[PDB]
Amino acid sequence: STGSATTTPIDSLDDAYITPVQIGTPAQTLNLDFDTGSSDLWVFSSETTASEVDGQTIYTPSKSTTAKLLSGATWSISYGDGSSSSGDVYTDTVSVGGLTVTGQAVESAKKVSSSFTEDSTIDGLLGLAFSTLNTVSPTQQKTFFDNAKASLDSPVFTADLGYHAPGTYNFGFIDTTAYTGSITYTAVSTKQGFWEWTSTGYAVGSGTFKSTSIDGIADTGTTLLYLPATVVSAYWAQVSGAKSSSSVGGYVFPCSATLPSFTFGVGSARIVIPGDYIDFGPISTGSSSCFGGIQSSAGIGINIFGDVALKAAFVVFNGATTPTLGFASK
């Protein structure tokens, strides 16, 4: 089997991408944030505290003839940005882009933190990291990809995120028309539950490539590119007037600036992030200070190849027995 679904930016900055997902029978379509940095499929629901729902579409398990309470199961998750959610668990039929999994754990939120309530465009998350990170207790549950893997033509999914435009998540096949050149594959460590890999270096603009190992995670659920402070300083030093602002929470730059590109290495290959992808616009409406899309990871504990980096590439998440990641230009 295969699936193919379009993913759409939630706003004009590509802060996140939503993908329609069919849950239950008859289908209830919710727009979920596909997150290769986490492993829970959770939704706003008829069980979510009413004051914490503000415009999201909810899953109502009592209206699905295929929903079954997973008795005793609870979940609770906290994300790197400090947001969180928790609840109980149903199993139900879940379909993405024509690919159907029966018996998928659908984690129904009883509580969500304010950042989720305040974003009416995201009805929940669909985790695509390794199932060892799933938070369901006392019986850990498998991700949608893990449940689908055996049925897929090939045990892979691909992320082709757009810049200020829709893109595609494919399951079970690699669309050879969606990228240019060849795909360069690189080793993955699953020891922390992430799609963790080592970039071979970077370049700033037209500068020379610096060969240096940068361990990080491919994370579609993170907006920005978070790299070591040395690398980030070298980038922003090429933008006149750019500075790190403690009050804003990262590097800002004059909105009048033209940003240089940023290149990252994948083996001997190179992925070029155009400068425009690094512009996240005014820090507040009407400001002439703009927020940078490359930020320091120093306070995170891990480097994160988020959407800023991933949308410059066609990215293969190869879930074979020994997982690997593939990157191609597009």
Curated annotation (Swiss-Prot):
It catalyses: Hydrolysis of proteins with specificity similar to that of pepsin A, prefers hydrophobic residues at P1 and P1', but does not cleave 14-Ala-|-Leu-15 in the B chain of insulin or Z-Glu-Tyr. Clots milk. One of its GO terms (molecular function) is aspartic-type endopeptidase activity. Its EC number is 3.4.23.22. Residues 17-328 form the Peptidase A1 domain. The active site is at D35, S199. The keyword Disulfide bond applies. Disulfide bonds join C255-C290. GO terms for biological process: proteolysis. It is an enzyme of class 3 (hydrolase). Keywords: Aspartyl protease, Disulfide bond, Hydrolase, Protease, Signal, Zymogen. Belongs to the peptidase A1 family. This is Endothiapepsin. It comes from Cryphonectria parasitica (Chestnut blight fungus).
